[PDB]
A and B are shown apart, each in its own frame.
Chain A
């Protein structure tokens, strides 16, 4: 620690680099913050969390109980220990309460006053945070598995929605619209997410064991299909071009948006060239994934190394995006971990699991 300080004061090594360099040092010795607590409201195992993109003060949580809990994560007690209280929650009394399991809940990129919620009650709901009413409600032929908006810009207001329907469904928030559809996947889509880097690029993870990347401005055809053998395998049609040996159900972009992480039902994580789809052959080993739903997992940023937090059984396994080397498996949950979500401001992490308990993970010393 002291050498870090005596370098920074002298201007030996770049200050902001030493922060990056310092920050990976914290993510390493991160442990289950025992002096923190997330208040228990969700009656179901947590299917999603989401921490605010600007300042990251408030958090949304989703649950199988069809509930949306909204949390304050700050502390202002004269003590060093505290319990994240829920400021608001869309509970059973509420006129618009989700009827069934809530699988994604996402803060409106570039507007904290709103947020979004999709469920297994085949709806997508738009929300006023400050009043707690509703704004827009959408409806789908099939159970919603994943929804997302690009955190790049506000040149578009499309919401990617990945239902059990093989058609991918893009919903304009601006107006009702919802007519826009993307076509090519053949089985249930389990994960959607946009490129942080690229404005109109969307990724799509269906159960048909393939992944696709779409320019939504294009009225036909995806841009690439992730092929795991990099062509090497002479495969017959409609069996070729399959990312995972089993249904693909996890998707997160790399901090910069230069790669993609697919985790499938075959227990693999694969790191992918987000441009050409080149399987980088980064190993990670067997990553137990036997879920029937989406797999919500996050990526670290603002540190030298880029880690990737994938929920592994009753733990969150921590890898090194580009080395593939596992650091550890954050252990605190007694039941299977559903989701995890990384805090960029203090290199923290929050896990929502079927144990119905959201847990905080901070670095130590």
Chain B
């Protein structure tokens, strides 16, 4: 409503720049990384990389080069922003107070000037005489360096040649020289102009121009020995130096476009090339010193490289916009040591309310082709490490207190392959040890601290009651025919040790192990529990068991052992763990199966009849549960590959994720070196930690090796529809097998209505839990999945996966043919319901009030679903330049356009047609579109911007949609969608970008906007930004056609940075306001409570 909030959910994760030099000090070889808005610095150490500084800029980073001018101690760094904010920055830091220092800055944007196709190019001279900029066609800007050019005053020099591919400086010339490839009608050619500062003009370069490749795309500046300039084509690679010509054309490079290279040997002998087919190459140069020959090896296969820098000793950092960033080690093949989760160009996403919780989850379609994937982002909690000792294969963990007098515990017991260890935990130093009464040669099924000052250690052998005060054994209970124990579960006074089918009940009185009951079971015993429910004395009246062979949860009355409720769970999957614990007040049950899928029941101790049932799959490997007393209440730490914590708040259940790869077993330990902490184990190590009250994000990549396009969730089918697109070169054959080849069941669309490397489109049924591809549908020849739908249509209450596709043929560059298909997945098989032929591509589909709305080219169209199981068109609307995005609320419909900004097309039912209610007449090329409520609307401008319209209220002019918010974000936003990743503001809108930045948006009342607005400008006073760049400049709406300050939008990150500034400088921000220091600090954190 009128005024809005913009804060980051996830930072950009994609690298469109990396650069390597002595940045922090003369000998620390830094790797510096450019992710769009952010600049990361790292020391190279023999083992891994050391993060020294990650900083945020006000502007997208377009140029980044290190350089050292004569006299200066260490390399200085240039940056330039897409808004052309140049800056030269030094890095100085005393102690640990870390500083980034501006030595120079200046915006160099020439108000007009046609901005060059290949885009901004920043190069710097070998001798540091000047800094050259090809920004705009026909114009070469020249930022000088030979005197204190602090304001970075530059002059232009006209450039006769206007279409230019790439330009670099060159080595060993007596005057700064540029070597560029340019294009007239005679193809692409290479040329040299020397550069003069006094003349302020280009003169004649050392050698004359030479013809080069039609697709010559790149210029490598060969250093001092040899000299010259290497030019990377697609067919061939040429070298020119002035007296020599040398050209090779290996068959191993023509496949794909070599996009990024880097000098490996500082004498320019080895060069790492790299292409979009992920392939790392080696350019070798051969050695009165001249060049002798060129040579290229194929080194291996990598994430598709945007930028690369070779560190030291075979190590290479790989920048990728297109997938997961890598760090690879050269070996024939190439082994990636490390790999960095970049959410590739986030092409689509969905909020999923799984676990029907107060919290949703995000699944994207991230990356393209070989890096193509989904991604699962959601909120979670890591643990504060203290000890992570490496004890492989711990089948169990129990805490005990060695001294009966102590109210602290100083014993931890661990199950193994056949025997049982003992861990002393010497205050703050864990060590192995012995224990009398407790065997270290039998496999422990249970132990703890029981009643009448006694101990217990149930092993496979027998129940063996121990007196704690003197040690030793006061009782031992074994099956009469001398047999082992099945499923052990005990508390502090009672035991019911299972054997095979039978059940042998026990009680732990003083110095005696008593029995009361023995009974057979229908089937062998699966899992047991009694945990002190109701207490009343410290006792159980029930027993929680499951079976095998039937898979049945059985609550029994204890002494009588009679069946009250024999629950049936079905399936060939059998119960794993079971527990009984009280939340808030109510009595719940929790049965964890072998596959994760957990049941939680409503229970009463008098009856036991299980009421209200649910099924919250919290993992995939067997899930063993454990109660742990989290301060005021007890929580449940489940154990699978998708570990979870469970507690309740306010009479409904919460399912908090844990940020760990897998936790096998767990038990609540409150020592003194580790008071109320955790004891956790996985396949390799044993870890001790504490809950992280700061709730970060968890991401789970799910590789696809092809292009993900759309994603919507079907609740009844409990799975995902995913639109895929694998490349195949000309019958064809795919290059690498993707997720659409390795399905279980497949299909190829049959339709006959529509009668050298092609895209093949599949619809992917992906299970919501396993994340495997249940079904893959191959669409027709050259059919293009562009829209996707999960919903039910008509009165027909069957859910459908509906896809809108087009027919792609080389001749036409706009589709005149496409179809809308209705699919159905249930009973494990992909049914096809209905067809529909239309005269072009469908770019958008969304359910509308019981109807299917779809954007067929320059037409927005509405469909009803005939009882005849076909689609009927109710009304059309022809006036659009290109209907790309649809979003709905009520009878209103938003329409984004290729350039017409946004129409709030409406629908009045009484006649059933399309009334144009209100349009925006700003000429905006659109990326994404969304309704916050019936009054305000957010859209994404092609030039990385966010505006909000509004309806205007006294005449017929009201059809003009009034802009009420302007904002520059910096991220090209590919999609919005409602929802929140938690549980001061209203509503919750999430967006996915190309740079992998995930963004929250929400709404505010004037009282806030004003209060927060001054605070921002008050921060920009106190804050020293990186390149000395203003905020409300970086936030001012900018295209070519307009520039206007940020109004109607608060930057949450600017507000959030407040908790990272120094103490008195906060009081400075207050000064006056309209509100004392500590009122602010709370609500800032309270605004963290939304993202």
From known contacts A11-B994, A15-B942, infer whether A304 and B112 are also in contact, taking CB-CB under 8 Å.
no
Query: Does residue B899 face the partner (Cβ distance < 8 Å to A)?
Result: yes
Cβ-defined contact, A2 with B879, below 8 A: no
B162 in contact with A16 (CB, 8 Å): no
A196: chain B residues at CB < 8 Å are 112
B576 in contact (CB, < 8 A): no
B919: A residues at CB distance < 8 A? 76
Q: Name the residue of chain A whose CB is nearest to the CB of B112.
A: A256
A9 at the interface (CB under 8 A from B): yes
Q: Is the CB of A344 within 8 A of B1041?
A: yes
Residue numbers in A under 8 Å from B960 (CB-CB): 76
**Could you say which of B808, B813, B814, B922 has the most chain A C-beta atoms within 10 Å of its C-beta?**
B813
Evaluate contact between A1 and B814: CB separation under 8 angstroms.
yes
Cβ-based interface call for B67 (8 A): no
Whether B675 sits at the interface, judged by CB under 8 Å, is no
B191 to chain A, nearest CB (A): 17
* A217 close to B (CB within 8 Å): no
| Interface flags, A299-325, vs B, CB<8A=1, else 0 | 001101010000000000000001100
Beyond A57-B921, A257-B112, A306-B114, is A10–B815 a contact (Cβ under 8 Å)? Answer: no
B1041 and A302 contacting across the interface, CB-CB below 8 Å: yes
Contact among B117, B185, B784, B994 with A2 in the assembled complex (CB-CB below 8 Å): B784
- Asked whether A178 is an interface residue with its Cβ less than 8 Å from the other chain, the reply is no
- Interface residues in A226-275 (C-beta closer than 8 Å to B): 255-258, 273, 275
When C-beta atoms are compared, the residue in chain A nearest to B916 turns out to be A78
Interface set, chain B 95-115, CB cutoff 8 A to A: 112-115
Closest chain A residue to B858 by CB distance?
A365
Residue of A with least CB distance to B942 = A15
Q: Counting chain B CB atoms within 10 Å of each CB, which of A8, A76, A258 scores highest? A: A258
Residue interface mask B311-348, A partner, CB < 8 A = 1? 00000000001100000000000000000000001010
A131 at the interface (CB under 8 A from B): no
B: contact size bracket? 35 or more
Q: Whole-angstrom distance from the CB of B862 to the nearest CB of chain A?
A: 16
Residues of A within 8 Å of B944, CB to CB, are 15
Contact A2 B899 (CB under 8 A): no
Q: Is A74 engaged at the interface, CB distance under 8 Å to the other chain?
A: yes
A10–B112 CB distance below 8 A: no
Per-residue interface assignment for chain B, residues 346 to 368, with 1 indicating a CB less than 8 Å from any chain A CB and 0 otherwise: 01000000000000000000001
Scan residues 994-1047 of chain B and give those whose CB is less than 8 A from a CB of chain A: 994-995, 1039-1041
CA of A201 to CA of B138 in the docked complex: distance in angstroms? 20
Asked if B974 is at the interface of the complex by the 8 Å CB criterion, the answer is yes
- The reply to whether A258 and B138 form a contact with Cβ atoms under 8 Å apart is yes
Q: How far is the CA of A55 from the CA of B901 in the complex (A)?
A: 13
> Is the pair A255, B347 in contact by a Cβ cutoff of 8 Å?
no
- CB pair A346–B923 under 8 Å, yes or no, is yes
Contact at B994–A9, with CB atoms within 8 Å? Answer: yes
Least distance between B1026 CB and chain A CB atoms (Å) = 23
Contact check, B923 vs A20: say whether CB atoms are below 8 A apart: no
B625 close to chain A: CB less than 8 A: no
Chain B residue numbers with a CB within 8 Å of A74 are 921
B949: min CB distance to chain A, Å: 15
- B-chain residues with CB within 8 Å of residue A55 when the two chains form the complex: 921-922
Query: CA A306 – CA B117 in complex, angstroms?
Result: 13
Give, as a whole number of angstroms, the nearest-CB distance from B470 to chain A: 73
A10 and B879 in contact, given A1-B813, A76-B919, A255-B112 (Cβ under 8 angstroms):
no
Which residues in A have their C-beta under 8 angstroms from that of B995? Answer: 11
Known contacts A16-B943, A19-B925; decide if A80 and B878 are in contact (CB<8 Å): yes
- Give 1 or 0 for each of A16-36: 1 = CB within 8 Å of chain B CB: 110111000000000000000
Per the bound structure, the CA–CA distance linking A259 and B1047 in Å amounts to: 38
Q: Which partner residue on chain A sits nearest B372 by CB separation? A: A10
Residue A79 at the chain B interface, CB threshold 8 Å: yes
Q: Is the CB of B879 within 8 A of A304?
A: no
Q: Does A179 make an interface contact (CB < 8 A)?
A: no
Measured CA separation A332–B879 after assembly (Å): 24
Q: Are B345 and A255 in contact (CB under 8 A)?
A: no
> With A57-B921, A76-B959, A256-B114 as given contacts, are A10 and B119 in contact (CB-CB < 8 Å)?
no
Contact B1041 A10 (CB under 8 A): no
Q: Which residues of the partner chain A approach B158 to less than 8 Å between Cβ atoms?
A: 258, 273, 275
Q: How far is the CA of A68 from the CA of B594 in the complex (A)?
A: 84
By a CB distance below 8 angstroms, the chain B residues around A10 are 322, 345, 347, 368, 994
A345 within 8 A of B: yes
Tell me, yes or no, whether A141 is within 8 Å of chain B by CB: no
Q: Which residues of A contact B915 (CB under 8 A)?
A: 78
> How many contacting A-B pairs (Cβ < 8 A)?
96
From A81, which residue of chain B is reached at the shortest CB distance? B879
Contact indicator per residue, chain A 332-362, by CB within 8 Å of chain B (1) or not (0): 0000000000001110000000000000000
Interface presence of B806 (CB below 8 A): yes
Q: Does B167 contact A (CB under 8 A)?
A: no
- A2 near B119: Cβ-Cβ < 8 Å: no
B528 at the interface (CB under 8 A from A): no
Residues of A within 8 A of B808 (CB): 2
Contact indicator A345/B347 (Cβ below 8 Å): no
Nearest residue in A to B974 (C-beta to C-beta)? A9
Given the contacts A255-B114, A256-B114, A346 and B139 also touching, CB distance less than 8 Å: no
B84 interface hit (Cβ, 8 Å)? no
Residues of B within 8 A of A257 (CB): 112
Interface string of B809-821 (1 = CB under 8 A from A): 0000111000000
Query: Considering only CB atoms, which chain B residue lies closest to A197 in the complex?
Result: B112
Question: What residues on A are CB-neighbors of B321 within 8 Å?
Answer: 11
In the complex the two chains form, is A15's CB within 8 Å of B119's CB? no
Question: In the complex, A255→B1040 CA distance in Å?
Answer: 12
- Tell me the complex Cα distance, A110–B879, Å: 33
Please tell me if A93 contacts chain B, counting CB pairs below 8 Å: no
Inter-chain CA distance A12–B972, complex, in Å, is 12
Q: How far is the CA of A275 from the CA of B160 in the complex (A)?
A: 12
Distance of B856 from chain A, by nearest CB (Å): 13
Complex Cα spacing A17 to B82, Å: 13
Any chain A CB within 8 A of the CB of B182?
A: no
B1041 touches A345 (CB 8 A): yes
Q: Are B972 and A15 in contact (CB under 8 A)?
A: yes
Q: How many Å from the CB of B904 to the closest CB on chain A?
A: 13
8 Å CB interface, B1027-1069 against A: 1039-1041
How far is it, in angstroms, between the C-alpha of A255 and the C-alpha of B162 when the chains are bound?
14
Which residues of A sit under 8 angstroms from B943, Cβ to Cβ? 15-16
CA distance A346 to B960 in the complex (A): 18
A256-B159 Cα distance, complex, nearest whole Å? 13
In the bound complex, CA of A20 to CA of B1041 (Å): 12
* Residue contact B345 to A256, C-beta cutoff 8 Å: no
Known: A10-B347, A256-B136. A17 touches B117 (CB 8 A): yes
B977 to chain A, nearest CB (A): 15
B218 interface contact, C-beta 8 A: no
Q: How far is the CB of B188 from chain A (nearest CB, A)?
A: 16
CA distance A255 to B943 in the complex (A): 20
* Contact, CB under 8 Å: A323 / B185: yes
Please give, as numbers and ranges, the residues of chain B lying within 8 Å of A323 by CB-CB distance: 185
Complex Cα distance A183/B628, Å?
A: 95
Nearest-Cβ distance from residue A9 to partner chain B, whole angstroms: 5
Residue B841 at the chain A interface, CB threshold 8 Å: yes
Contact check, A20 vs B115: say whether CB atoms are below 8 A apart. yes
Check A304–B347 contact: CB distance below 8 A: no
Q: Given A11-B994, A19-B925, output 4 extra A-B contacts at Cβ < 8 Å.
A: A1-B814, A16-B115, A258-B139, A301-B114
> What are 13 A-B contacts with C-beta separation under 8 Å?
A1-B813, A10-B994, A11-B345, A16-B115, A17-B115, A20-B114, A20-B117, A76-B919, A76-B959, A258-B139, A302-B1040, A304-B117, A323-B185
Q: Which residues of B contact A (CB under 8 A)?
A: 14, 112-115, 117, 119, 136-139, 158, 162, 185, 321-322, 345, 347, 368, 784, 786, 806, 808, 813-815, 841, 843, 878-879, 882, 884, 899, 915-916, 919, 921-923, 925, 927, 942-944, 956, 959-960, 972, 974, 994-995, 1039-1041
- Chain A contact residues, CB within 8 Å of chain B: 1-2, 5, 8-12, 14-17, 19-21, 55, 57, 74, 76, 78-80, 196-197, 255-258, 273, 275, 301-302, 304, 306, 322-323, 344-346, 365
